[PDB]
Structure formats: structure tokens, C-alpha cells
Design a protein around this ligand. Sequence first.
Ligand code: CLA
Ligand SMILES: C/C(C=C=C1C(C)(C)C[C@H](O)C[C@@]1(C)O)=C/C=C/C(C)=C/C=C/C=C(C)/C=C/C=C(/C=C/[C@@]12O[C@]1(C)C[C@@H](O)CC2(C)C)CO
Ligand SMILES: CC(/C=C/C=C(C)/C=C/[C@@]12O[C@]1(C)C[C@@H](O)CC2(C)C)=C\C=C\C=C(C)\C=C\C=C(C)\C=C\[C@@]12O[C@]1(C)C[C@@H](O)CC2(C)C
Ligand SMILES: CC(/C=C/C=C(C)/C=C/[C@@]12O[C@]1(C)C[C@@H](O)CC2(C)C)=C\C=C\C=C(C)\C=C\C=C(C)\C=C\[C@@]12O[C@]1(C)C[C@@H](O)CC2(C)C
Ligand SMILES: CC(/C=C/C=C(C)/C=C/[C@@]12O[C@]1(C)C[C@@H](O)CC2(C)C)=C\C=C\C=C(C)\C=C\C=C(C)\C=C\[C@@]12O[C@]1(C)C[C@@H](O)CC2(C)C
Lengths: 164, 85, 166
Amino acid sequence: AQSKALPFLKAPAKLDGSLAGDFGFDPMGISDQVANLKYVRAAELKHCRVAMLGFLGWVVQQYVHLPGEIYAESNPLKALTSVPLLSQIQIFLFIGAIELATLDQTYTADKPWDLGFDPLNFSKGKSEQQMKDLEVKELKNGRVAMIAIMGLIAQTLYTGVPLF
Amino acid sequence: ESTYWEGKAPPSVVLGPFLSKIPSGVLGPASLVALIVGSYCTHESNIFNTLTVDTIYPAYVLGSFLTPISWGLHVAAWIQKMNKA
Amino acid sequence: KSKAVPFLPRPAALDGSVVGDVGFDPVGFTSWLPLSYLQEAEIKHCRIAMLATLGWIVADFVHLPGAVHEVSSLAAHDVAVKSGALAQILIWTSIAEAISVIAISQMLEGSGRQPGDFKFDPLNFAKDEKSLKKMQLSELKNGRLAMLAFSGIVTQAALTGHAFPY
Ligand code: CLA
Ligand SMILES: C/C(C=C=C1C(C)(C)C[C@H](O)C[C@@]1(C)O)=C/C=C/C(C)=C/C=C/C=C(C)/C=C/C=C(/C=C/[C@@]12O[C@]1(C)C[C@@H](O)CC2(C)C)CO
Ligand SMILES: CC(/C=C/C=C(C)/C=C/[C@@]12O[C@]1(C)C[C@@H](O)CC2(C)C)=C\C=C\C=C(C)\C=C\C=C(C)\C=C\[C@@]12O[C@]1(C)C[C@@H](O)CC2(C)C
Ligand SMILES: CC(/C=C/C=C(C)/C=C/[C@@]12O[C@]1(C)C[C@@H](O)CC2(C)C)=C\C=C\C=C(C)\C=C\C=C(C)\C=C\[C@@]12O[C@]1(C)C[C@@H](O)CC2(C)C
Ligand SMILES: CC(/C=C/C=C(C)/C=C/[C@@]12O[C@]1(C)C[C@@H](O)CC2(C)C)=C\C=C\C=C(C)\C=C\C=C(C)\C=C\[C@@]12O[C@]1(C)C[C@@H](O)CC2(C)C
């Protein structure tokens, strides 16, 4: 009834109105245990962003490579082992440096997903409806990418073909 | 509710809202049939014919599971009979 | 008192339902289970049997967009579980049924979901209540006929080997 995604079920109590992308999709009632939807939305958006970047990297590594030889592997899962540990540890350290401040931030803030990242100011001057539309676009694209990046990983692990 | 009882038989609510509405004249014969079927299945899988890897027969196994069940069915049959059902 | 069985009395739980209540319950199964759960089971069986009868009949006549699909809908089960199609259909059917547990559990508990209702009318073949009731009765009658017909089809096509007459 109240779920748009599952037009027959009634959504849970915490799925209503605000927090764009709310289509009443919580059949298992996971939202009933979390105190709020702030942390789960932060986790969902982090997954969405990481999955978008992962899909883009998957395709680009399929087609484009860095000039060096160590980056010449086309299969992303094979490149996970071919690439030297120095590059991967540098990436991990960069991510952890970004992650510790946001670790302090996420567990207490009202909008843990709002990291203040807008270098090009794509949100300055946008109205509330436009901002909500942008949030919906981001969430949609992220969910589709998550499904897609998991599918790419599965098909590479099951057939060895990284794409198509 | 109030499954607690002190009379001769417990209230029919202790049987659940599926056995609470079965007449005792149905549960009784059903319990006896289930007990006979389960005993025969147990005695056909084993005892009369020795068990082997090639002879397991899910019917006899599933059947044999009716013996433990039978116990519950006739207990419920007695409970229904004493509760004017 | 019963409309279907004049001898036996009308079932206590069957008074009126647009699902085709003609008071046919000689064994009193409606006393055992909630009527709503039995209605959901009946509608599920109806739809499955209709789809299966149509699929069996069609797949014996014109079904070969490939090589592994050159079977006679009697050896089709093993061939196409070996191929892997039945696995995918089972996966999606399991997802739908797991969702259906909550649908069955949201009814029998409150809400307003009628048995067998999934709000799937994309083409809007039913418009008002009268059309909805008429076509619910039609769907259930067709589904019962399809249940019996598929039973006959499998029993005959296993008692012999033949085509559509079976
Ligand atoms: C990391 C994954 C992740 C996380 C944390 C969330 C989190 C959230 N989603 Mg969400 N979503 C995701 C992935 C995720 N989503 C994907 C991939 C899709 C596309 C199908 C969606 C589609 C979607 C819709 C349409 C809606 C939500 C909503 C919500 C919010 C409320 C539901 C909730 O509390 O569930 C928390 C969820 C988890 C804790 C994840 C548990 C992990 C389970 C067990 C998944 C198990 C694996 C799965 C069955 C199969 C994956 C393998 C492969 C096939 C992909 C919450 C912020 C609702 C919303 O906006 O509310 C504000 C809403 O309406 N989501
Ligand atoms: C690519 C392909 C095959 C192939 C090819 C080529 C590339 C095309 C050509 C080459 O030459 C060969 C080859 C092999 O490569 C395509 C395959 C065919 C598809 C993709 C079709 C799928 C069939 C769907 C079926 C059969 C589903 C049945 C429905 C059920 C519903 C169940 C329900 O109970 C549920 C769960 C809820 C209930 O409420 C009611 C209902 C709804 C009835 C199952 O009962
Ligand atoms: C799909 C997914 C999560 C799906 C979860 C779903 C659907 C859950 C749905 C539900 O909970 C709700 C919503 C509500 C509940 O009531 C009901 C259910 C149904 C239970 C996460 C994907 C998450 C996908 C992620 C995080 C992708 C990460 C990408 C990474 C890590 C990067 C990898 C690479 O770097 C390597 C490894 C090597 C390089 O060569 C290549 C690249 C690609 C660059
Ligand atoms: C990357 C992406 C968006 C990236 C946006 C970025 C970085 C924007 C960053 C900024 O805005 C901020 C944040 C703040 C601004 O102030 C600054 C900038 C910097 C401007 C979306 C991708 C979104 C990506 C999506 C939605 C991908 C969907 C993929 C699908 C459907 C793939 C399917 C398949 O892969 C399978 C599954 C199997 C294959 O075999 C077959 C096919 C079909 C190829
Ligand atoms: C499939 C079927 C109906 C399917 C309808 C569907 C999917 C409609 C779906 C939708 O409408 C909804 C739901 C919502 C709409 O908004 C959208 C769509 C998507 C359009 C009926 C089958 C119905 C199948 C029936 C009725 C079977 C009849 C068989 C009979 C009568 C007997 C035959 C035999 O006697 C012979 C001929 C010879 C003997 O040897 C053998 C036997 C078998 C014994």
C-alpha cells in the first residue's frame, strides 16, 4: 500500500516523506531496529559512491591504461594482484585518511553523508526541489552501479570475461 | 489465552489455532492411522528389512516421523474429547 | 443449505465472496484454516496451472529457438534443468514467493490485502468493482479448469507418448 516499490506491502514506520529515494522498500523491516535512518543512509550513499567509482574504473581499465607496464593488466581482478603493493597501500592510506575524520563525523551528525564535498559548487543556488532531485539521481545511479559492480565481479570470477 | 489449567483437561487453546478446531472424532482415528503407518514404515525400513545405503526410502523415513507425531495427535484428540469437541 | 451440494449443509465460513462462493466444502476445510489463506493458495494454484497448461500445449507445438529446446515437454524438465533455464526460473520464483510470505503475513494479521491481490493490473483490464468481481470469478473458474486440464495432460502424456490429443 504505502510502498512504491512493493505496492502491496505497507512500508515500515521510519520510511516516510523526507530522505529522498524513499520508495518504501524495506520488506524485512531492517529500519525498525536502527534508531534513525542517518547512519544507514550514510552507509548506502558511501556504497553508492564507491560503486559508481568502481564501475567507472572497471570500464576505463578495460579500455584505458596508464603508460607504465605494471598497469597493463586488463582484467581488474587480475590487476588486483599484478599491481604492486605500493600503489594499493598508498590508495588504502589515502582512503583511511579520508575515513578517520569522517569516522568522527558519521556516528554523531544529523547528515553523516554530507561530507561538504562540492568543489565545483553544483549545489550553490539550487532550490530545495532541485537539491532533492539531485539526491534522488545520485541514489538511483548508485543503486544501479552497486548491482552492476557486483555483477561484473561475479561474471569475472565465474567466467573470466571482465565485460560483456 | 491463559493456557494455565487446573481442571481435568487443559483448554483447547493449548493445541494452537489449528488443532483447537479439529473435532476429536477426526483427531482420534487420524492419530491411530498415523501411529499404525509410522510403525509400519519403521518396521519396513528396518527390523523386517535391514537398512542399506541403497535402501533409504524417504516415504518410510518421512513415514516413521508420523510415530512421534502420532503421540501428539492422540494427545490433542483426548484434549478435544474432554473439552466437548 | 449449500448451493453446490444440496444434500450437505452450507459451510459455516462460506457466506459471500466474489471469488465464486457456491458453498462447496464437504470436508469443511474452511473451518480448519482461515478462509483467506485457502483463497490465496487456490488463486496461486489457479495461476500456476493456467500458465503451465498453456506452456505445455505451446511448447509441444512451436518451441525451438535453438537446439536444447527440441524436446516434447515431457523430457523437457530434465533437459532444461541440465541447461540451466529452470534454475533461473526457480531463483526468480523463490524471490517472488519469499516476498509473498510477507504479503500472506501482512494479511491474516490486518492490512487490507485481498487474497491473491498483488496490484498487478498494468493494462487496467478491470475498471470498477463489478468488472473486478466478474473477472475474479472468471479467473478462478479458468484456473480450476486449468488445474484439472494440466492434471489430465501430465497423466495422459505419462501413460503414453503422443501429441496434443494425449
Ligand atoms: C550497501 C547496501 C545498501 C544499504 C546499506 C542500503 C540502505 C538503505 N536503503 Mg537501499 N538499496 C540498495 C543497497 C543498499 N541500501 C540496492 C543495491 C538497491 C537497489 C535494489 C536499493 C534500493 C533501495 C530502495 C528502493 C529503497 C532503499 C532504502 C534504503 C534505506 C532503508 C532500508 C534499510 O534500512 O535497509 C538497510 C539495508 C541494509 C543494512 C543492507 C543489508 C544487506 C542485505 C542482507 C542484502 C543481502 C544481499 C542481497 C539480498 C543480494 C545482493 C547480491 C546481488 C544480487 C546484488 C537504507 C538507507 C529505502 C529508503 O530510501 O529509505 C530511506 C527505499 O525505499 N534502498
Ligand atoms: C535467451 C533465452 C534462451 C536462449 C537461447 C537463444 C539465445 C534465445 C537462442 C539460441 O539459439 C539458444 C539459446 C539457449 O542460447 C531466453 C529464455 C527464455 C526466457 C527468458 C523466458 C522465461 C520464462 C518464464 C517462465 C516459464 C516463468 C514462469 C512463471 C511462474 C510463476 C510462478 C508464480 O507462482 C508464483 C511464484 C507466484 C504466484 O502467485 C503465481 C505465479 C506468478 C504463477 C513459475 O510457475
Ligand atoms: C549490491 C550491494 C548491496 C545490495 C543490498 C541490497 C540489494 C539489499 C536490499 C535490502 O536491504 C534492503 C534495501 C531492505 C531490506 O528490507 C530488504 C533487502 C532486500 C534485504 C552492494 C554493492 C556494493 C559494491 C561495491 C561496494 C563496489 C565496490 C568497488 C570496489 C571495492 C572497487 C574495486 C576495484 O578496485 C578493485 C577491487 C580492482 C580494480 O582493478 C577494479 C575496481 C573496480 C576499481
Ligand atoms: C560515475 C558516476 C558519477 C560520478 C560523478 C562524480 C564523480 C561527480 C563528482 C562531483 O559531483 C560531485 C560529487 C561534487 C561536485 O561539486 C564536484 C564533482 C567532482 C563534479 C555515476 C555512475 C553510475 C553508473 C551506473 C549507473 C552504472 C550502471 C551499469 C550498468 C547497468 C552495467 C551493466 C553491465 O556491467 C554489467 C552489469 C555486466 C556487463 O557484462 C554488461 C553491462 C551492461 C556493461
Ligand atoms: C494462460 C491463461 C491466462 C493468462 C493470462 C495472463 C498471463 C494475463 C496477464 C495480465 O492480465 C493480467 C494478469 C494483468 C493485465 O493488466 C496484464 C496482463 C499481463 C495482460 C489461461 C490459461 C488457461 C488454460 C486452460 C483454461 C486450459 C484448458 C484445457 C482444457 C480445457 C482441456 C484440454 C484437454 O481436453 C483436451 C483439449 C485434450 C486432452 O487430451 C487434454 C486435455 C488437457 C484434458
